[PDB]
Amino acid sequence: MRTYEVMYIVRPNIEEDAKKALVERFNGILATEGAEVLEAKDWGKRRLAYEINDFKDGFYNIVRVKSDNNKATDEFQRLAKISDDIIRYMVIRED
Amino acid sequence: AIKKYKPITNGRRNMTSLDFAEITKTTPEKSLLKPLPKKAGRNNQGKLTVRHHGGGHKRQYRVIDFKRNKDGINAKVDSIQYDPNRSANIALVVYADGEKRYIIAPKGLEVGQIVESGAEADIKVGNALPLQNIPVGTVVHNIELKPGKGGQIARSAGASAQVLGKEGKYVLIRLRSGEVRMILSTCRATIGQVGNLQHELVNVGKAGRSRWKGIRPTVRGSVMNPNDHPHGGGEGRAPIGRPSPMSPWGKPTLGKKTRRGKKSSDKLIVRGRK
Amino acid sequence: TVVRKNESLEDALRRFKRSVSKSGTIQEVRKREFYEKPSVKRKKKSEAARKR
Amino acid sequence: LRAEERNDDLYAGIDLINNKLERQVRKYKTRINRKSRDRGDQ
Protein backbone atom coordinates (compact mmCIF):
# COMPACT_ATOMS: atom_id res chain seq x y z
CA MET A 1 0.00 0.00 0.00
CA ARG A 2 3.10 2.19 0.40
CA THR A 3 5.80 2.48 -2.26
CA TYR A 4 9.40 2.92 -1.09
CA GLU A 5 12.58 3.53 -3.13
CA VAL A 6 15.78 2.85 -1.21
CA MET A 7 19.23 3.69 -2.53
CA TYR A 8 22.40 2.43 -0.86
CA ILE A 9 26.06 2.78 -1.76
CA VAL A 10 28.84 0.21 -1.23
CA ARG A 11 32.64 0.44 -1.17
CA PRO A 12 34.63 0.60 -4.42
CA ASN A 13 37.45 -1.60 -3.08
CA ILE A 14 35.49 -4.84 -2.98
CA GLU A 15 35.69 -7.79 -5.35
CA GLU A 16 32.96 -9.65 -7.23
CA ASP A 17 31.22 -12.19 -5.01
CA ALA A 18 31.81 -10.03 -1.95
CA LYS A 19 29.59 -7.45 -3.69
CA LYS A 20 26.78 -9.81 -4.69
CA ALA A 21 26.76 -11.43 -1.25
CA LEU A 22 25.83 -8.13 0.41
CA VAL A 23 23.03 -7.26 -2.01
CA GLU A 24 21.38 -10.64 -1.41
CA ARG A 25 21.19 -10.26 2.35
CA PHE A 26 19.35 -6.96 1.96
CA ASN A 27 16.80 -8.08 -0.64
CA GLY A 28 15.80 -10.76 1.86
CA ILE A 29 15.62 -8.07 4.54
CA LEU A 30 13.67 -5.90 2.09
CA ALA A 31 11.29 -8.83 1.54
CA THR A 32 10.70 -9.48 5.26
CA GLU A 33 7.29 -8.84 6.90
CA GLY A 34 5.44 -8.62 3.59
CA ALA A 35 7.58 -6.24 1.56
CA GLU A 36 7.70 -7.96 -1.90
CA VAL A 37 10.31 -6.05 -3.95
CA LEU A 38 9.24 -4.77 -7.37
CA GLU A 39 12.76 -4.89 -8.82
CA ALA A 40 16.38 -4.23 -7.83
CA LYS A 41 18.13 -2.12 -10.45
CA ASP A 42 21.86 -1.50 -10.05
CA TRP A 43 23.76 1.49 -11.33
CA GLY A 44 27.41 0.96 -12.17
CA LYS A 45 30.45 2.80 -10.93
CA ARG A 46 29.81 6.54 -10.60
CA ARG A 47 32.42 9.17 -9.82
CA LEU A 48 30.60 10.50 -6.77
CA ALA A 49 30.89 14.23 -6.35
CA TYR A 50 32.83 14.39 -3.06
CA GLU A 51 34.89 12.39 -0.62
CA ILE A 52 33.12 10.12 1.89
CA ASN A 53 35.42 7.85 3.97
CA ASP A 54 38.25 8.98 1.61
CA PHE A 55 36.82 7.07 -1.37
CA LYS A 56 36.57 8.16 -5.00
CA ASP A 57 33.94 5.84 -6.52
CA GLY A 58 30.79 3.99 -5.53
CA PHE A 59 28.51 1.22 -6.78
CA TYR A 60 24.91 2.36 -6.55
CA ASN A 61 21.69 0.39 -6.06
CA ILE A 62 17.97 1.08 -6.59
CA VAL A 63 15.42 -1.21 -4.94
CA ARG A 64 11.69 -0.39 -5.08
CA VAL A 65 9.55 -1.88 -2.30
CA LYS A 66 5.74 -2.03 -1.98
CA SER A 67 4.91 -2.40 1.72
CA ASP A 68 2.34 -1.22 4.24
CA ASN A 69 4.20 -1.70 7.51
CA ASN A 70 7.56 0.13 7.63
CA LYS A 71 9.14 -2.94 9.17
CA ALA A 72 11.45 -3.97 6.34
CA THR A 73 13.11 -0.66 5.50
CA ASP A 74 13.83 0.51 9.05
CA GLU A 75 15.38 -2.92 9.59
CA PHE A 76 17.51 -1.95 6.58
CA GLN A 77 18.31 1.35 8.30
CA ARG A 78 19.35 -0.54 11.43
CA LEU A 79 21.82 -2.92 9.78
CA ALA A 80 23.33 -0.67 7.08
CA LYS A 81 24.74 1.61 9.77
CA ILE A 82 26.29 -1.42 11.50
CA SER A 83 28.11 -2.77 8.44
CA ASP A 84 31.24 -0.84 7.48
CA ASP A 85 30.83 -1.53 3.74
CA ILE A 86 27.47 0.05 2.88
CA ILE A 87 28.47 3.67 3.22
CA ARG A 88 25.22 5.67 2.77
CA TYR A 89 21.52 4.83 2.47
CA MET A 90 18.21 6.64 1.94
CA VAL A 91 14.62 5.42 1.78
CA ILE A 92 11.97 7.72 0.30
CA ARG A 93 8.24 7.13 -0.09
CA GLU A 94 6.77 7.90 -3.50
CA ASP A 95 3.08 8.80 -3.44
CA ALA B 1 17.11 6.72 39.15
CA ILE B 2 16.87 8.32 42.59
CA LYS B 3 14.12 8.64 45.18
CA LYS B 4 13.65 11.53 47.58
CA TYR B 5 12.39 10.78 51.07
CA LYS B 6 9.53 12.78 52.51
CA PRO B 7 10.61 14.64 55.68
CA ILE B 8 8.74 12.49 58.19
CA THR B 9 11.71 12.81 60.59
CA ASN B 10 14.63 15.20 61.05
CA GLY B 11 17.06 12.43 60.16
CA ARG B 12 15.09 11.34 57.11
CA ARG B 13 14.49 14.93 55.98
CA ASN B 14 16.96 15.91 53.25
CA MET B 15 18.10 12.33 52.73
CA THR B 16 18.14 11.07 49.16
CA SER B 17 18.46 7.41 48.30
CA LEU B 18 18.95 5.42 45.11
CA ASP B 19 16.32 3.05 43.78
CA PHE B 20 17.85 -0.11 42.44
CA ALA B 21 16.13 -0.32 39.08
CA GLU B 22 19.21 -1.45 37.16
CA ILE B 23 19.46 -4.42 39.56
CA THR B 24 17.71 -7.48 38.15
CA LYS B 25 18.61 -10.12 40.77
CA THR B 26 18.97 -9.32 44.45
CA THR B 27 20.83 -12.50 45.44
CA PRO B 28 24.58 -13.17 45.11
CA GLU B 29 26.04 -16.06 43.17
CA LYS B 30 27.12 -18.62 45.74
CA SER B 31 30.29 -19.89 44.01
CA LEU B 32 31.98 -16.48 43.50
CA LEU B 33 31.68 -15.20 47.08
CA LYS B 34 34.46 -15.02 49.61
CA PRO B 35 34.79 -13.90 53.25
CA LEU B 36 35.86 -10.31 53.81
CA PRO B 37 36.69 -9.50 57.43
CA LYS B 38 37.14 -5.86 58.31
CA LYS B 39 40.60 -4.51 59.06
CA ALA B 40 39.30 -1.29 60.55
CA GLY B 41 42.28 0.92 59.83
CA ARG B 42 44.67 -1.48 61.57
CA ASN B 43 47.71 -3.12 59.99
CA ASN B 44 49.55 -6.37 60.86
CA GLN B 45 51.05 -4.74 63.97
CA GLY B 46 47.53 -4.35 65.35
CA LYS B 47 47.51 -0.56 65.54
CA LEU B 48 45.42 1.98 63.69
CA THR B 49 47.32 3.35 60.69
CA VAL B 50 44.49 5.07 58.81
CA ARG B 51 41.81 6.94 60.72
CA HIS B 52 38.00 6.92 60.47
CA HIS B 53 37.35 3.24 59.72
CA GLY B 54 35.22 0.97 61.86
CA GLY B 55 32.28 -1.31 62.03
CA GLY B 56 29.92 -0.99 59.12
CA HIS B 57 27.63 -3.66 57.79
CA LYS B 58 29.04 -7.14 57.26
CA ARG B 59 30.10 -7.76 53.66
CA GLN B 60 31.02 -10.65 51.37
CA TYR B 61 33.63 -10.18 48.66
CA ARG B 62 32.61 -11.10 45.12
CA VAL B 63 35.57 -12.21 43.04
CA ILE B 64 35.30 -10.39 39.72
CA ASP B 65 37.89 -10.56 36.97
CA PHE B 66 39.57 -7.30 36.14
CA LYS B 67 41.80 -9.24 33.79
CA ARG B 68 39.75 -10.40 30.83
CA ASN B 69 41.33 -13.60 29.62
CA LYS B 70 38.89 -15.94 27.86
CA ASP B 71 39.57 -14.98 24.26
CA GLY B 72 36.95 -15.40 21.57
CA ILE B 73 34.35 -17.09 23.78
CA ASN B 74 31.00 -15.35 24.01
CA ALA B 75 29.42 -14.43 27.33
CA LYS B 76 25.71 -13.80 27.81
CA VAL B 77 24.75 -11.64 30.77
CA ASP B 78 22.50 -13.19 33.40
CA SER B 79 21.94 -10.29 35.69
CA ILE B 80 23.09 -6.96 37.07
CA GLN B 81 23.73 -7.27 40.77
CA TYR B 82 24.61 -5.19 43.80
CA ASP B 83 28.15 -5.10 45.18
CA PRO B 84 28.89 -3.41 48.53
CA ASN B 85 32.63 -3.34 47.93
CA ARG B 86 32.65 -0.90 45.04
CA SER B 87 30.75 2.06 43.70
CA ALA B 88 29.73 0.33 40.45
CA ASN B 89 27.35 -2.53 39.85
CA ILE B 90 28.59 -5.94 38.77
CA ALA B 91 27.37 -8.14 35.95
CA LEU B 92 27.19 -11.92 36.11
CA VAL B 93 28.25 -12.97 32.63
CA VAL B 94 27.98 -16.62 31.63
CA TYR B 95 30.17 -18.07 28.92
CA ALA B 96 28.99 -20.42 26.19
CA ASP B 97 31.92 -22.46 27.47
CA GLY B 98 29.87 -22.81 30.68
CA GLU B 99 31.87 -20.86 33.27
CA LYS B 100 30.29 -18.06 35.31
CA ARG B 101 32.14 -14.92 36.41
CA TYR B 102 31.46 -11.27 37.20
CA ILE B 103 32.58 -8.15 35.36
CA ILE B 104 31.79 -4.56 36.34
CA ALA B 105 28.57 -3.59 34.61
CA PRO B 106 28.95 -0.82 32.01
CA LYS B 107 26.43 1.95 31.45
CA GLY B 108 24.22 0.50 28.77
CA LEU B 109 24.34 -3.22 29.49
CA GLU B 110 21.28 -5.43 29.37
CA VAL B 111 20.52 -9.06 30.12
CA GLY B 112 20.90 -11.55 27.31
CA GLN B 113 23.72 -9.51 25.75
CA ILE B 114 26.88 -11.17 24.48
CA VAL B 115 30.36 -10.03 25.49
CA GLU B 116 33.64 -10.92 23.74
CA SER B 117 36.97 -10.47 25.52
CA GLY B 118 39.69 -10.94 22.92
CA ALA B 119 41.71 -9.23 20.22
CA GLU B 120 39.30 -10.07 17.37
CA ALA B 121 36.41 -8.34 19.11
CA ASP B 122 33.87 -5.84 17.86
CA ILE B 123 34.01 -2.40 19.45
CA LYS B 124 30.88 -2.66 21.57
CA VAL B 125 29.93 -1.83 25.15
CA GLY B 126 31.42 -4.39 27.53
CA ASN B 127 33.95 -5.99 25.17
CA ALA B 128 37.56 -6.16 26.33
CA LEU B 129 40.40 -5.93 23.84
CA PRO B 130 43.96 -4.55 23.83
CA LEU B 131 44.65 -0.85 23.47
CA GLN B 132 46.48 -1.47 20.19
CA ASN B 133 43.26 -2.78 18.63
CA ILE B 134 41.06 -0.11 20.24
CA PRO B 135 40.46 2.75 17.77
CA VAL B 136 41.39 6.28 18.71
CA GLY B 137 38.64 8.46 20.18
CA THR B 138 36.39 5.95 21.91
CA VAL B 139 35.76 5.96 25.64
CA VAL B 140 36.96 2.95 27.53
CA HIS B 141 37.39 1.70 31.08
CA ASN B 142 38.80 -1.04 33.33
CA ILE B 143 42.22 -0.19 31.97
CA GLU B 144 45.19 -2.43 32.56
CA LEU B 145 48.29 -0.54 33.57
CA LYS B 146 50.59 -3.55 32.99
CA PRO B 147 49.83 -6.39 30.54
CA GLY B 148 48.11 -9.29 32.27
CA LYS B 149 47.79 -7.79 35.76
CA GLY B 150 44.16 -6.80 35.31
CA GLY B 151 42.35 -3.52 34.92
CA GLN B 152 43.12 -0.85 37.49
CA ILE B 153 42.18 2.49 36.02
CA ALA B 154 38.76 4.17 35.53
CA ARG B 155 36.86 1.56 37.46
CA SER B 156 34.55 3.32 39.93
CA ALA B 157 31.01 4.20 38.92
CA GLY B 158 30.65 6.54 35.97
CA ALA B 159 34.37 6.50 35.16
CA SER B 160 35.69 6.50 31.62
CA ALA B 161 38.76 7.43 29.61
CA GLN B 162 39.05 8.33 25.94
CA VAL B 163 41.89 7.09 23.76
CA LEU B 164 43.76 10.14 22.45
CA GLY B 165 46.50 8.85 20.16
CA LYS B 166 49.15 6.21 19.61
CA GLU B 167 52.91 6.38 20.15
CA GLY B 168 55.29 3.51 19.20
CA LYS B 169 54.37 0.96 21.86
CA TYR B 170 52.12 3.30 23.85
CA VAL B 171 48.68 4.82 23.50
CA LEU B 172 47.67 8.21 24.81
CA ILE B 173 44.60 8.41 27.00
CA ARG B 174 42.81 11.10 28.99
CA LEU B 175 41.70 10.18 32.46
CA ARG B 176 38.55 11.10 34.38
CA SER B 177 40.96 13.14 36.48
CA GLY B 178 41.94 15.09 33.36
CA GLU B 179 45.44 13.63 33.26
CA VAL B 180 47.00 12.57 29.96
CA ARG B 181 49.10 9.46 30.39
CA MET B 182 50.86 6.93 28.20
CA ILE B 183 49.66 3.37 28.77
CA LEU B 184 51.46 0.39 27.22
CA SER B 185 49.81 -0.74 24.03
CA THR B 186 49.44 -4.44 24.87
CA CYS B 187 47.04 -3.74 27.74
CA ARG B 188 43.34 -4.48 27.96
CA ALA B 189 40.58 -1.91 28.43
CA THR B 190 36.86 -2.64 28.07
CA ILE B 191 34.84 -0.46 25.71
CA GLY B 192 32.33 1.91 27.28
CA GLN B 193 31.52 3.75 30.48
CA VAL B 194 30.88 1.87 33.71
CA GLY B 195 27.35 2.32 35.03
CA ASN B 196 25.64 3.29 38.29
CA LEU B 197 25.97 6.91 37.22
CA GLN B 198 23.84 8.41 40.01
CA HIS B 199 26.05 7.09 42.81
CA GLU B 200 27.57 10.53 43.43
CA LEU B 201 24.17 12.14 43.94
CA VAL B 202 22.96 10.35 47.07
CA ASN B 203 22.42 12.60 50.05
CA VAL B 204 23.01 10.08 52.83
CA GLY B 205 21.25 12.56 55.09
CA LYS B 206 22.03 10.99 58.44
CA ALA B 207 24.93 10.46 60.85
CA GLY B 208 24.02 6.78 60.97
CA ARG B 209 24.11 5.99 57.25
CA SER B 210 27.74 7.05 57.40
CA ARG B 211 28.32 4.58 60.24
CA TRP B 212 26.73 1.74 58.27
CA LYS B 213 29.30 2.41 55.55
CA GLY B 214 32.09 1.85 58.04
CA ILE B 215 33.01 5.52 58.38
CA ARG B 216 33.85 6.46 61.96
CA PRO B 217 33.43 10.15 62.83
CA THR B 218 36.19 12.69 62.19
CA VAL B 219 37.08 15.05 65.00
CA ARG B 220 38.66 18.28 63.75
CA GLY B 221 42.21 19.24 64.54
CA SER B 222 41.36 22.68 65.91
CA VAL B 223 39.33 21.20 68.78
CA MET B 224 42.26 19.22 70.16
CA ASN B 225 45.03 19.86 72.67
CA PRO B 226 48.53 20.81 71.50
CA ASN B 227 49.87 17.29 71.76
CA ASP B 228 47.13 15.76 69.62
CA HIS B 229 47.36 18.12 66.66
CA PRO B 230 49.39 21.12 65.47
CA HIS B 231 46.13 23.12 65.52
CA GLY B 232 45.78 22.41 69.23
CA GLY B 233 44.23 24.46 71.92
CA GLY B 234 44.02 28.19 72.26
CA GLU B 235 41.64 29.90 74.65
CA GLY B 236 38.24 29.72 73.08
CA ARG B 237 38.08 29.09 69.38
CA ALA B 238 41.34 30.08 67.77
CA PRO B 239 42.48 30.59 64.19
CA ILE B 240 44.99 28.06 62.97
CA GLY B 241 47.86 30.35 63.94
CA ARG B 242 50.51 28.88 61.62
CA PRO B 243 51.57 29.85 58.08
CA SER B 244 49.68 26.86 56.65
CA PRO B 245 47.08 24.26 57.60
CA MET B 246 48.86 21.17 58.81
CA SER B 247 48.01 17.49 59.09
CA PRO B 248 47.89 15.55 62.42
CA TRP B 249 51.53 14.51 61.86
CA GLY B 250 53.06 17.89 61.11
CA LYS B 251 52.98 18.10 57.34
CA PRO B 252 51.57 21.15 55.49
CA THR B 253 48.29 19.96 54.07
CA LEU B 254 46.84 22.78 51.96
CA GLY B 255 48.35 23.10 48.50
CA LYS B 256 51.67 21.31 48.96
CA LYS B 257 52.36 18.57 46.42
CA THR B 258 53.30 15.14 47.73
CA ARG B 259 53.96 13.12 44.57
CA ARG B 260 57.30 11.41 45.08
CA GLY B 261 59.42 12.58 42.18
CA LYS B 262 62.35 10.83 40.48
CA LYS B 263 59.87 8.13 39.52
CA SER B 264 59.55 5.75 36.57
CA SER B 265 56.14 6.93 35.36
CA ASP B 266 57.37 10.52 35.22
CA LYS B 267 58.28 9.83 31.57
CA LEU B 268 54.71 8.68 30.92
CA ILE B 269 52.59 11.48 32.40
CA VAL B 270 52.04 14.05 29.66
CA ARG B 271 49.54 16.51 31.13
CA GLY B 272 48.66 17.02 34.79
CA ARG B 273 45.29 16.91 36.47
CA LYS B 274 42.42 19.14 35.35
CA THR C 1 38.74 27.66 -8.35
CA VAL C 2 39.24 28.59 -12.01
CA VAL C 3 42.58 27.96 -13.71
CA ARG C 4 43.76 30.83 -15.94
CA LYS C 5 46.82 30.35 -18.15
CA ASN C 6 48.22 31.25 -21.61
CA GLU C 7 48.22 34.94 -20.62
CA SER C 8 49.80 37.37 -18.16
CA LEU C 9 48.94 37.84 -14.48
CA GLU C 10 47.24 41.23 -14.95
CA ASP C 11 44.55 39.50 -17.05
CA ALA C 12 44.03 36.44 -14.83
CA LEU C 13 43.19 38.94 -12.08
CA ARG C 14 40.41 40.40 -14.25
CA ARG C 15 38.86 36.94 -14.44
CA PHE C 16 39.42 36.34 -10.73
CA LYS C 17 38.11 39.72 -9.55
CA ARG C 18 34.71 38.96 -11.11
CA SER C 19 34.80 35.24 -10.27
CA VAL C 20 34.80 36.31 -6.61
CA SER C 21 32.28 39.16 -6.90
CA LYS C 22 29.90 36.61 -8.45
CA SER C 23 30.21 34.38 -5.38
CA GLY C 24 29.05 34.32 -1.79
CA THR C 25 32.42 34.96 -0.16
CA ILE C 26 32.97 38.70 0.32
CA GLN C 27 29.30 39.57 0.84
CA GLU C 28 29.00 36.54 3.14
CA VAL C 29 31.91 37.19 5.51
CA ARG C 30 31.05 40.90 5.71
CA LYS C 31 27.61 39.79 6.90
CA ARG C 32 29.14 37.51 9.56
CA GLU C 33 31.56 40.04 11.03
CA PHE C 34 29.26 40.33 14.06
CA TYR C 35 26.14 38.58 15.31
CA GLU C 36 23.00 40.39 14.28
CA LYS C 37 19.76 40.01 16.17
CA PRO C 38 17.40 37.28 14.84
CA SER C 39 14.71 39.85 13.89
CA VAL C 40 16.91 42.63 12.46
CA LYS C 41 18.21 40.47 9.59
CA ARG C 42 14.61 39.86 8.53
CA LYS C 43 14.38 43.63 8.03
CA LYS C 44 17.91 43.79 6.61
CA LYS C 45 16.89 41.20 4.01
CA SER C 46 13.65 43.15 3.51
CA GLU C 47 15.56 46.36 2.75
CA ALA C 48 17.85 44.37 0.42
CA ALA C 49 14.75 43.12 -1.45
CA ARG C 50 12.34 46.07 -1.54
CA LYS C 51 15.07 48.13 -3.21
CA ARG C 52 16.08 45.20 -5.51
CA LEU D 1 32.46 80.04 26.14
CA ARG D 2 29.77 82.48 27.28
CA ALA D 3 27.32 82.23 30.17
CA GLU D 4 25.14 84.65 32.13
CA GLU D 5 23.30 84.58 35.45
CA ARG D 6 20.91 87.30 36.61
CA ASN D 7 21.12 86.50 40.31
CA ASP D 8 22.06 88.99 43.02
CA ASP D 9 24.18 86.59 45.09
CA LEU D 10 27.63 86.91 43.54
CA TYR D 11 28.71 83.63 45.19
CA ALA D 12 25.70 81.44 44.37
CA GLY D 13 25.44 82.74 40.80
CA ILE D 14 28.95 81.52 39.95
CA ASP D 15 27.81 78.08 41.11
CA LEU D 16 25.54 78.25 38.03
CA ILE D 17 28.07 79.96 35.74
CA ASN D 18 30.53 77.11 36.32
CA ASN D 19 27.65 74.72 35.63
CA LYS D 20 26.98 76.38 32.27
CA LEU D 21 30.71 76.62 31.54
CA GLU D 22 31.31 72.91 32.20
CA ARG D 23 28.42 71.94 29.92
CA GLN D 24 29.72 74.01 27.00
CA VAL D 25 33.24 72.55 27.05
CA ARG D 26 31.84 69.02 26.77
CA LYS D 27 29.87 70.17 23.72
CA TYR D 28 33.14 71.44 22.23
CA LYS D 29 35.18 68.33 22.97
CA THR D 30 32.73 65.65 21.81
CA ARG D 31 32.39 67.69 18.62
CA ILE D 32 36.10 67.12 17.95
CA ASN D 33 36.44 63.72 19.66
CA ARG D 34 34.73 61.98 16.74
CA LYS D 35 38.17 61.47 15.19
CA SER D 36 37.69 57.78 16.08
CA ARG D 37 35.92 56.78 12.87
CA ASP D 38 36.94 53.45 11.35
CA ARG D 39 37.74 54.48 7.76
CA GLY D 40 39.81 51.94 5.84
CA ASP D 41 41.33 53.22 2.61
CA GLN D 42 40.91 51.37 -0.68
Binding site: - | - | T1, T25, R30, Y35 | -
Partner: protein, 114 residues
Protein backbone atom coordinates in the same frame (compact mmCIF):
# COMPACT_ATOMS: atom_id res chain seq x y z
CA UNK E 1 60.69 19.14 -4.92
CA UNK E 2 61.90 21.54 -7.62
CA UNK E 3 59.26 23.79 -9.23
CA UNK E 4 56.05 22.38 -7.74
CA UNK E 5 54.10 23.87 -4.88
CA UNK E 6 51.09 25.56 -3.32
CA UNK E 7 51.14 29.21 -2.25
CA UNK E 8 48.83 30.08 0.66
CA UNK E 9 47.89 33.67 1.45
CA UNK E 10 45.23 34.72 3.95
CA UNK E 11 45.01 38.49 4.25
CA UNK E 12 42.64 39.22 7.13
CA UNK E 13 41.60 42.74 8.16
CA UNK E 14 45.09 42.93 9.71
CA UNK E 15 48.50 41.41 8.99
CA UNK E 16 48.66 39.78 5.55
CA UNK E 17 50.31 36.38 6.11
CA UNK E 18 51.79 34.17 3.38
CA UNK E 19 53.13 30.60 3.59
CA UNK E 20 54.41 28.87 0.47
CA UNK E 21 54.52 25.08 0.55
CA UNK E 22 54.74 22.06 -1.75
CA UNK E 23 51.80 20.45 -3.55
CA UNK E 24 51.25 18.11 -0.57
CA UNK E 25 51.50 20.91 2.01
CA UNK E 26 54.60 20.87 4.21
CA UNK E 27 55.37 24.60 4.84
CA UNK E 28 58.45 25.32 2.72
CA UNK E 29 58.78 28.96 3.80
CA UNK E 30 56.65 31.74 5.25
CA UNK E 31 56.75 35.46 5.94
CA UNK E 32 54.43 38.12 7.31
CA UNK E 33 54.03 41.87 7.57
CA UNK E 34 55.20 41.77 11.19
CA UNK E 35 58.42 40.11 10.03
CA UNK E 36 59.24 43.26 7.99
CA UNK E 37 59.18 45.84 10.79
CA UNK E 38 55.50 46.75 10.41
CA UNK E 39 54.59 46.87 14.10
CA UNK E 40 50.85 47.53 14.04
CA UNK E 41 48.00 48.81 11.80
CA UNK E 42 50.39 49.45 8.89
CA UNK E 43 50.09 45.72 8.19
CA UNK E 44 46.56 46.17 6.77
CA UNK E 45 47.86 47.76 3.57
CA UNK E 46 48.43 46.48 0.03
CA UNK E 47 51.92 48.00 0.31
CA UNK E 48 52.64 45.51 3.10
CA UNK E 49 51.75 42.75 0.64
CA UNK E 50 54.15 44.32 -1.89
CA UNK E 51 57.14 43.08 0.13
CA UNK E 52 55.81 40.22 2.27
CA UNK E 53 55.01 37.93 -0.68
CA UNK E 54 58.41 37.61 -2.35
CA UNK E 55 60.44 37.69 0.88
CA UNK E 56 59.13 34.20 1.62
CA UNK E 57 59.17 33.14 -2.03
CA UNK E 58 62.70 34.28 -2.87
CA UNK E 59 63.96 33.21 0.55
CA UNK E 60 62.79 29.63 0.06
CA UNK E 61 66.03 28.41 -1.58
CA UNK E 62 65.82 24.79 -0.39
CA UNK E 63 64.49 23.14 -3.55
CA UNK E 64 63.94 25.83 -6.20
CA UNK E 65 60.15 25.57 -5.94
CA UNK E 66 59.45 28.24 -8.55
CA UNK E 67 55.79 27.63 -9.39
CA UNK E 68 53.10 28.56 -6.89
CA UNK E 69 49.42 28.25 -8.08
CA UNK E 70 48.34 30.53 -5.24
CA UNK E 71 45.41 30.03 -2.82
CA UNK E 72 43.43 32.91 -1.26
CA UNK E 73 41.98 32.28 2.21
CA UNK E 74 41.05 35.66 3.66
CA UNK E 75 39.03 38.87 3.25
CA UNK E 76 41.63 41.61 3.29
CA UNK E 77 42.82 44.82 1.64
CA UNK E 78 46.07 43.33 0.36
CA UNK E 79 44.36 40.36 -1.27
CA UNK E 80 45.06 40.84 -4.99
CA UNK E 81 48.15 42.97 -4.26
CA UNK E 82 49.96 39.90 -2.88
CA UNK E 83 49.66 37.95 -6.15
CA UNK E 84 50.42 41.02 -8.26
CA UNK E 85 53.60 41.37 -6.17
CA UNK E 86 54.27 37.64 -6.58
CA UNK E 87 55.17 38.17 -10.25
CA UNK E 88 57.71 40.69 -9.01
CA UNK E 89 59.42 37.49 -7.92
CA UNK E 90 58.11 35.99 -11.17
CA UNK E 91 57.03 32.48 -10.22
CA UNK E 92 54.43 31.63 -12.96
CA UNK E 93 51.15 32.00 -11.07
CA UNK E 94 48.97 29.49 -12.91
CA UNK E 95 45.89 28.66 -10.78
CA UNK E 96 44.33 31.25 -8.46
CA UNK E 97 41.76 29.91 -5.99
CA UNK E 98 39.59 31.72 -3.44
CA UNK E 99 39.39 28.90 -0.90
CA UNK E 100 37.96 30.82 2.04
CA UNK E 101 36.06 29.27 4.98
CA UNK E 102 32.37 30.03 4.48
CA UNK E 103 30.05 28.43 7.07
CA UNK E 104 26.73 26.77 6.37
CA UNK E 105 25.32 28.87 9.26
CA UNK E 106 27.13 26.74 11.80
CA UNK E 107 28.22 28.71 14.87
CA UNK E 108 27.28 31.90 16.69
CA UNK E 109 29.47 34.86 15.64
CA UNK E 110 30.57 37.41 18.29
CA UNK E 111 28.72 40.53 19.44
CA UNK E 112 28.10 43.68 17.43
CA UNK E 113 30.66 46.44 17.98
CA UNK E 114 29.37 49.78 19.26
Amino acid sequence: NIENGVAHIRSTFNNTIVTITDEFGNALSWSSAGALGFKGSKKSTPFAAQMASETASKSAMEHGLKTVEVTVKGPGPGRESAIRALQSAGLEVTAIRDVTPVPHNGCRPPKRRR
